[PDB]
Amino acid sequence: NTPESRLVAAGLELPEVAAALGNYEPYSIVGSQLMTSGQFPYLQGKLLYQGQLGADYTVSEGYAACRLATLNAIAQLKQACGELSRIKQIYRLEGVLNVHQSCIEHPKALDGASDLLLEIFGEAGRHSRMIWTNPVMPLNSLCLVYLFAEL
Amino acid sequence: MMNTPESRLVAAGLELPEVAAALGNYEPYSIVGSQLMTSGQFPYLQGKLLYQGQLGADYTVSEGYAACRLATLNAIAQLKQACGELSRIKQIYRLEGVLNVHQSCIEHPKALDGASDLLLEIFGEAGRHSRMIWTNPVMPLNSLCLVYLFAEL
Amino acid sequence: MNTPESRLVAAGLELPEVAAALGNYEPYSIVGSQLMTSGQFPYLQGKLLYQGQLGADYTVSEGYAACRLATLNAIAQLKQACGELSRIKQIYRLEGVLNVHQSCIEHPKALDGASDLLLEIFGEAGRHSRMIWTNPVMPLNSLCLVYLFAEL
Numbered sequence A: 001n002t003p004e005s006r007l008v009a010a011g012l013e014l015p016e017v018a019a020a021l022g023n024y025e026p027y028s029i030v031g032s033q034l035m036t037s038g039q040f041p042y043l044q045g046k047l048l049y050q051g052q053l054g055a056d057y058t059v060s061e062g063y064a065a066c067r068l069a070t071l072n073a074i075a076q077l078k079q080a081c082g083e084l085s086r087i088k089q090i091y092r093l094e095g096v097l098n099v100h101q102s103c104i105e106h107p108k109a110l111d112g113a114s115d116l117l118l119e120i121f122g123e124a125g126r127h128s129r130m131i132w133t134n135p136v137m138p139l140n141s142l143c144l145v146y147l148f149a150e151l
Numbered sequence B: 001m002m003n004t005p006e007s008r009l010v011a012a013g014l015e016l017p018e019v020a021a022a023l024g025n026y027e028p029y030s031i032v033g034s035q036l037m038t039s040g041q042f043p044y045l046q047g048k049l050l051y052q053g054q055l056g057a058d059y060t061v062s063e064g065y066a067a068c069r070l071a072t073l074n075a076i077a078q079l080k081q082a083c084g085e086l087s088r089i090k091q092i093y094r095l096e097g098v099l100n101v102h103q104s105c106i107e108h109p110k111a112l113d114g115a116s117d118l119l120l121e122i123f124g125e126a127g128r129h130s131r132m133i134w135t136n137p138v139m140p141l142n143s144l145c146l147v148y149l150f151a152e153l
Numbered sequence C: 001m002n003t004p005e006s007r008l009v010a011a012g013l014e015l016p017e018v019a020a021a022l023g024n025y026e027p028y029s030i031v032g033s034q035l036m037t038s039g040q041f042p043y044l045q046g047k048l049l050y051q052g053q054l055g056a057d058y059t060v061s062e063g064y065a066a067c068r069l070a071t072l073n074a075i076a077q078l079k080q081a082c083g084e085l086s087r088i089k090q091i092y093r094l095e096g097v098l099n100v101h102q103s104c105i106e107h108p109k110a111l112d113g114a115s116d117l118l119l120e121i122f123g124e125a126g127r128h129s130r131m132i133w134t135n136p137v138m139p140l141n142s143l144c145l146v147y148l149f150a151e152l
């Protein structure tokens, strides 16, 4: 029973992996640690969420956005390791959101990422996390997600 | 008798707080190999978030220093829960801190020294760390700061 | 041999003197085979050359120049730690912070100043993943801060 089967059972198709925005690699590996560059909420090559939590998007939409960015991040991890069953653990999630001052519910939005990790990787998806808000995002994305995996 | 981090906390008159619950569906710490890393730690005292606002607007630099010190005390409580005896930590090799800072203030590195100085006070040479610092406009719980620690076991 | 040092020479780049910490922390630390710097600034001859905000005070090409200079500072730090830059197996990660005005989202182009220098100087050993942030307030009002992670 693989992460891939769970994606199928959840009705989730892994997107095509997006190109870097600059002269960097989409992931790197040091020893047993695999880490992604920033992953966006793309669907069918379109950046679906462009704006700010609390102003343009509700918390439930932010949740959806972090879920989709994480699906993109998982696509990136699959590209890197072939079979997602090779991943011993997704030990760390780090996420950035653009958030209006009137809203401090961004940890709920980032649960979109956390929840998918647990859904797809099970106990292997239990992770620590970091959260940031930034005023300006690449592509005006609502969010950016980074994953760290142990092989 | 023994020069443990715990004895230094006692000597400093510092009691470790109870470890706060996660704000979402994540672990308070994770371990990969010999690397133990916390999730975000807040300046809680007796279950109350003591600093809520922005450096330079709501809090002075010395208050930010105190806030980062308290968040780091919380982070040390988290580490103690994870490893039992803080003597088991070979080094706190990295501190990463976030503050909410008003444009009129660039003395946030001095605030984050509240964290760095406590790591050195409590862990001695094992507390020597590199560090990252960020400012963010919006914080969870409107906290003035958030601290993350990374330790080698 | 073609080495990072020889490539710096070829690019006409001199490594700056390594700046002091802004607080009670180490300029780098090491866990296992992983070396990680603290924040590195765009210093030239001991002067912080870029103080302000991308899109407001500095253009994208100036941001690129700033990130390049901060990265040259970071490489100076790496050379101090490792002695010979050939001993670095890889610069596996770059993490950069910029202060950026709402009117500008071309900060990834500015951070390419850092990414491009790593590739120019370290070649294949300079291929890295990266993280980018924007923060409203920076230490020393620097335009940018760069952090490097190297495998030893």
Ligand SMILES: [Ca+2]
Pocket (backbone or CB within 6 Å): none
């Ligand atoms: Ca990191």
Ligand code: NA
Pocket (backbone or CB within 6 Å): A055, A056, A057, A058
């Ligand atoms: Na909307």
Ligand code: NA
Pocket (backbone or CB within 6 Å): B057, B058, B059, B060
């Ligand atoms: Na006040």
Ligand code: NA
Pocket (backbone or CB within 6 Å): C056, C057, C058, C059
């Ligand atoms: Na200018």
